[PDB]
Amino acid sequence: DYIVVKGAREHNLKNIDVKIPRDKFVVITGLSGSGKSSLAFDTIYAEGQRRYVESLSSYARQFLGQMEKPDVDYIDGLSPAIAIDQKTTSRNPRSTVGTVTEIYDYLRLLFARIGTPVTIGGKNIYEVCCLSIGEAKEFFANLNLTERQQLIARQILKEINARLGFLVDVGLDYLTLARAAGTLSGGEAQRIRLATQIGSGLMGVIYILDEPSIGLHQRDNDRLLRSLKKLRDLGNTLLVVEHDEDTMYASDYIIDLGPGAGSHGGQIVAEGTVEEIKQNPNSVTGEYLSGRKKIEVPKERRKPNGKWLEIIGARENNLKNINVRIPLGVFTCITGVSGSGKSSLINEILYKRLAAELNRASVKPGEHDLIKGIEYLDKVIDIDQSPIGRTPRSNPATYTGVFDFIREIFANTTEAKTRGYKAGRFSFNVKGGRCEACAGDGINKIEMHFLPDIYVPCEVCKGKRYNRETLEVRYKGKNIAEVLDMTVEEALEFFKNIPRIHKKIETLYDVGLGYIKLGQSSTTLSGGEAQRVKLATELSRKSTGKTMYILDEPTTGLHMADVHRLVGILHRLVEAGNSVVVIEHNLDVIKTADYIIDLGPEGGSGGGLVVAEGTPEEVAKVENSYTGQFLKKVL
Amino acid sequence: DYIVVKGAREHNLKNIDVKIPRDKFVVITGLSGSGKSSLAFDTIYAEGQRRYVESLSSYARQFLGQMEKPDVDYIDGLSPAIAIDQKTTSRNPRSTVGTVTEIYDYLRLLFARIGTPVTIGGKNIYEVCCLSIGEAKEFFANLNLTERQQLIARQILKEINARLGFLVDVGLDYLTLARAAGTLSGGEAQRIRLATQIGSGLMGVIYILDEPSIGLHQRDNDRLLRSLKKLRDLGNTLLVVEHDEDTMYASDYIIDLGPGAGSHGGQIVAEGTVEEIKQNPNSVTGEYLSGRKKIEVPKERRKPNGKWLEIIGARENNLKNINVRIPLGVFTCITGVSGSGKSSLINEILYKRLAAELNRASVKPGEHDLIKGIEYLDKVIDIDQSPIGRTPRSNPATYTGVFDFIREIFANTTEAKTRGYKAGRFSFNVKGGRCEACAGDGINKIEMHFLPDIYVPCEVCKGKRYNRETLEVRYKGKNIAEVLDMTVEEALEFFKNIPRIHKKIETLYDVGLGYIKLGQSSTTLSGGEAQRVKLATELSRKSTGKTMYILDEPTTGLHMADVHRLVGILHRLVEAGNSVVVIEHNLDVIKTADYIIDLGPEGGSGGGLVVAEGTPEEVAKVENSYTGQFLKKVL
DNA sequence: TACTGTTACGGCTCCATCGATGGAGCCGTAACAGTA
DNA sequence: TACTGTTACGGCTCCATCGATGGAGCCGTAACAGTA
Ligand SMILES: Nc1ncnc2c1ncn2[C@@H]1O[C@H](COP(=O)(O)OP(=O)(O)NP(=O)(O)O)[C@@H](O)[C@H]1O
Ligand SMILES: Nc1ncnc2c1ncn2[C@@H]1O[C@H](COP(=O)(O)OP(=O)(O)NP(=O)(O)O)[C@@H](O)[C@H]1O
Ligand SMILES: Nc1ncnc2c1ncn2[C@@H]1O[C@H](COP(=O)(O)OP(=O)(O)NP(=O)(O)O)[C@@H](O)[C@H]1O
Ligand SMILES: Nc1ncnc2c1ncn2[C@@H]1O[C@H](COP(=O)(O)OP(=O)(O)NP(=O)(O)O)[C@@H](O)[C@H]1O
Ligand SMILES: [Zn+2]
Ligand SMILES: [Zn+2]
Per the database record, which ranges form the ABC transporter domain (chains A, B) (predicted)? Predict the structure, then answer.
């Protein structure tokens, strides 16, 4: 009846005791970096999987793999749990939709066990696989089988019917089972990843969802919420780590983590229903929901000054040769249903053509006739929708690029010049200044065979990643280890007289990363922290006053406060005299835009046509687009 | 707090609802074939494993293997469960004790991760493996390790220490890790099989024990009971399916099944503590425990009539060249601690020499000088301690040997003679008279890849295993299918005028198998039913009036009523004028013997010497043997 | 001549036992080419 | 001459993905050899 956890200290949790109700829709909210993933996926799922795995043999334990033991005293009422990782998964070119969703295995088993010779229903496996999902579902539903065949193929057809029903319900009826899984959009890939594990509902099983609404429109989010409620009605428990308002409004219990991020968070601020969350002043999320603090919609929206970008004959992917006009000098946002073809337009035609024309790139653009107005811009800066890599040899300092400047400054010191030291000796990834015992890792990870891995600190370098000779040289009383061991605010105060580093450190601080350390490993970075680091890396570049920013879904893993900060930054950049084009699904960012280009009205082959275009007030008057329907309530 | 099961109909359970307390020592008792294994191992363990496996991926599900879905409505309060199968497991010659107990893997990991070059504590892996278990435990306990080494090897040494402690506690301190696992006795192999899975105790895990006291003396049973109580004190639940009195007296809760066996059982008769079980008249086990029905100890014990069998210089295995005298014409029982060397004496010297001298066998006997008194016997009949095979092409009718006579009788009919039918056409294991569609199996088993297997009956033969041509010929109004489809009592009534079949059917009925069908498959046979079938197969052979019976542990899987029936049969055979030598651990059988040969006083290299010898009253006066100490209380 | 012990000889069934390769991203280094 | 965009080139790291062989037992058939 409860999932009571007492004494949890994983990562940055400050020994919190939480009682999670069972057979409910419990949602964990909080700021980015607060510790929600460490609370759910790193503790509850880890403990459940470890308990279920320890009872198996050595072969099974070494094959499945045992997760690291969480630093939790005891957990009561645990049940077998299925969880989906927050980090997105790349797909091999050979993989298709059917193999990823595991429906291909059931199709093969059905054809092998029931197929009359390899032909069931007058069709071979090739015709079934090269078929639409809705067509396959309606063909399998109306299947005439004999008594013996129906008896044999019961648990084979039931699972296929359930999976196809879920895939139709989420809205993927236009896909084919032979289509490659790597060419799907963000929302389609997210839905496929969900359906791989949640389509066939079990009973008495805890379902852990780590941001299941990535790249999904509000209309798709409503359908997924209805599907999740239907699954929960089977008698399961759902724990959803989300940032959207709809999920909070459609949840029975809300658990809030905070009150900040990093070292300032990891606690529990408020608990209860939505009304209890709103009435609690200590909750930042509750205050934002109640409207006490909100994103300010502009009173007057800027109008184009006669400068326009014209795209003529854009027919990339599913685009039906449309003509789109993007105003220059104003904040432009593009909205559409998941799969309508907005990224396939912008990131595959406009950004590539702009880069080829201005930055002298060598990337082939999309299928289009011509673009008018390229001469009005000087350079193009873009943020892709692809995820960032995670390696132990990476950190914010070496990712945003301040590490090169810091190393050059350290090599410019008198002691380094006397000792004949270059800039490469001060990096832990090049031999010469890295402790050879631990290969500059700082710690040594001992890998077992079936037992969980154990981390032991290095003794030669004490964990400072550098030998004694390199740490001797100090700049302004600090060596490189203490340089990498201070937060962003301390680095901002330290490098205040060096503009080259100060600009990038100020950019990092602006997005809200004043608590992070310059040497924190990338593998330990949160999803929201990694997204904000990627945003700051591109926003730290110099602007010439006539530039175009192309941001593709920067809301991934960002709380309401973080997106408010990003909105403020983008508005300041626009007011400076630059043009920003944002492909967004969050209503808060769109409701402040000065221009909206709407695509749809559906996804897949059914979309690719401009439905609405103009200011948000004018777009809200169009009943054809669901974006207008949502903007009616938002405005 | 409970393991509540409602609506269980697996095998022969008549929809019983049982509430099993948690964190206790619950013991399930009942007659042989009542349905205890079907209640615990086929339902609770199956449901728990299925629930824990369904949450994994397709690869994991197909690798681990999903057990058949039990026919149970719902089970509440299940947790991860570890169970040990009742059926014994043979061991390959290459396997040793360390590899079977999984301590070799931990030794290899310790030597690879901590060993200084492959040498920890001044010894290589060869010296550690070629060492006594007690010596290895005391060497590992007093291990001097540095700070880093102790930090690294914590969960490696803890498991080794726990496993060696359990192996010392059970009483296997005389074994070596390099000793082959196939050469151990029954009790040693049982203890090794236990230690493989129960040595390292977990928390909040259900432990299911399926007869864990096979081939164990009472002294070893007490030690194992103390170890089980220590493990249960860790906060686990133990469900023990046993037949001994000590386990019932040392259990918190007792659940009694019955009231009979086969189709007459599968119910629940009484529940509560030991006093509640005794006070309930409906429980056969309770009545036997309370002394209302008990095995009658003879008032006067027969004395030898001057006929003796002398074994001189028996030095097989661990025997220290002892001289043993076995009286002839009386019921002789041999008692000793597990591993003392009683089977290695009898079954390896006496039986082999008797078979070679009388039955003209070609089996090499053990290491001994000579045997005096072989000329006093005519033939030797023995029952080994090895388990019986289980194949779908086997049944009691074809195992006890009545199938050959039945087939000859069927081929002797007028219709068979007219049709040119031989005896082979009436067997389902030979082409010609079996349904070729199912190859005589009767049912077809469809095998999936990861899903549980589904059994579908054959349609060509309707499940009668024979075609239409063979079923036409009927003997006394019954064809071969109806012959195989009647119980043992019906066969006894049917074949009452044919002594050749009547003798074997009466032998089968005597041991208490009047409910079994002649065509029931061996794979579906219970352990006790298989043991009784094996006993009847050898007891059905003709006796010449001067014969020797050598029964090696016939109590395996037999209830008190079954062993009472066997004791009566053996006493009648002895009174007929034959000599019976029984290697036994059950006190009920020994307490009625007319002569006892005691071996010990310990196991392994510490035993092999005759401690006591004579009538049970005289043996009970010896304080050196634990058998005398137990007979003091028994008598 | 029949019953009963052993053996062989063929066929069927059950059960124990034991991570690597390709694709993608990131960091450090070098080089080339525009702007300022 | 400095800042900044692009490219290449080598090295390190992370993540997706996909049951068989030998040993033992049992059943049906045939043969050989003692007892009765
Ligand atoms: N391995 C680690 N070692 C140390 N700190 C870590 C590690 N992993 C994460 N952290 C920090 O722990 C805090 C909480 O991380 P995490 O629980 O992943 O955040 P989160 O609330 O789920 N954020 P987000 O996913 O963006 O919503 C952050 O400050 C992380 O930087
Ligand atoms: N390489 C490709 N070949 C064929 N079809 C494609 C390809 N890439 C994308 N598509 C399809 O084109 C449509 C639009 O894709 P895309 O424009 O990437 O989506 P999107 O608008 O960014 N959706 P989302 O990321 O969910 O916001 C979808 O039906 C995709 O399945
Ligand atoms: N697969 C099966 N199909 C049909 N009947 C079966 C099957 N397996 C077992 N049985 C019968 O079900 C009854 C109970 O079997 P089981 O539950 O194994 O007995 P048990 O009480 O554990 N006996 P024992 O192990 O000797 O103590 C017996 O009459 C068996 O012959
Ligand atoms: N082939 C063998 N080689 C060496 N030692 C052996 C062998 N077989 C058995 N032993 C040992 O000889 C001792 C007696 O074995 P054995 O006589 O078979 O035991 P037992 O008395 O029948 N015990 P149990 O079956 O438990 O009642 C034990 O220490 C065994 O480990
Ligand atoms: Zn080091
Ligand atoms: Zn058939």
Answer: 295-632
Q: Which of A510, A537, A553 is the last residue of a domain?
A: A510
Q: Answer for the pair B129, B177: CB distance below 8 angstroms, yes or no.
A: yes
Give me the phi and psi of B453, to 5 degrees please: -70, 150
Count of domains forming chain A: 2
Contact by Cβ (8 Å): A567, A554? no
Instruction: Report yes or no on B128 lying in a domain.
Output: no
Q: Are residues B476 and B623 in the same domain?
A: no
CATH code for position A336: 3.40.50.300
Nearest CA to ligand 1 atom 29: A262
**Which of B344, B364, B553 should be mutated for ligand 4, with most atoms under 8 A from CB?**
B344
Neighbours of B151 (CB within 10 A): 13
DSSP H or E segment with residue A240: strand A237-241
Cβ atoms B19, B4 nearer than 8 A: yes
Strands B25-29 and B253-258: parallel
B36 in a labelled binding site: yes
Q: What residue ranges in A299-347 does DSSP mark as E strands?
A: 308-314, 322-327, 331-336
Chain A: residue nearest B196 by CA?
A57
Distance CA B334, CA A70 (A): 55
Domain that holds residue B430: 400-510
* A372 plus A402 within the same structural domain: no
Asked if B82 has any chain A CB less than 8 Å from its own CB, the reply is yes
Do B560 and B414 share a structural domain?
no
Q: Which residues of B166-195 are buried (b: 16+ CB within 10 A; e: fewer)?
A: bbebbbbbbbbbebebeebbbbbbbbbbbb
**A614 bridge partner residues:** A596
Within this chain, do residues A343 and A364 fall inside the same structural domain, yes or no?
yes
Residues A379, A401, single domain; the answer is no
Looking at B477, B510, B543, the residue that finishes a domain is B510
Domain at B440, CATH number: 1.20.1580.10
* A527's tokens: 């999803």
DSSP category for residue A475: B
- Give the start-end residues of each E strand in B39-148: 72-75, 81-84
A60 CA: distance to closest CA in chain B (Å): 7
Q: What's the rounded Cα separation, in Å, for the pair B484 and B516? A: 11
Cα atoms found within 13 Å of the Cα of residue B389, Cβ hemisphere only: 5
Residues A560 and A608 in one domain: yes
> Considering the domain boundaries, does residue B330 fall inside one?
yes
Long-range CB contact pairs, A218-221, < 8 A, 24+: A218/A246, A218/A585, A218/A587, A218/A626, A218/A630, A219/A337, A219/A626, A220/A170, A220/A171, A220/A187, A220/A191, A220/A337, A220/A338, A221/A246, A221/A247
Q: What is the amino acid identity at position A562?
A: D
- Which of A50, A55, A459 should we substitute to test contact with B (largest number of B Cβ atoms within 10 Å)? A55
Residue B460 lies in a domain: yes
Q: Same domain for B593 and B545?
A: yes
Task: Please return the burial class of A12, using the count of CB atoms within 10 Å of its CB with bins 0-12, 13-18 and 19+.
Answer: middle
Answer whether A55 touches B (CB < 8 Å).
yes
* A469 DSSP β-pair partners: none
Burial of A380 (0-12, 13-18, 19+ CB in 10 A): buried
User: Which contacts (CB < 8 Å, 24+ apart) does range B11-15 have?
Assistant: B11/B35, B11/B38, B11/B42, B11/B266, B12/B38, B12/B262, B12/B263, B12/B265, B12/B266, B13/B38, B13/B39, B13/B43, B13/B266, B14/B266, B14/B267
User: Using an 8 Å Cβ cutoff, are B484 and B397 in contact?
Assistant: yes
**Parallel, antiparallel, or unpaired for β A237-241 and A206-210?**
parallel
Residues A505 and A534 in one domain: no
CA dist B90 and A522 (Å) reads 52
Please tell me if residue A148 touches chain B, with a CB cutoff of 8 Å: yes
User: What are the residue ranges of helices labelled H in B96-143?
Assistant: 97-100, 103-113, 125-129, 133-141
In a domain, B462, yes or no: yes
How far: A544 CA to D11 C1' (Å)?
36
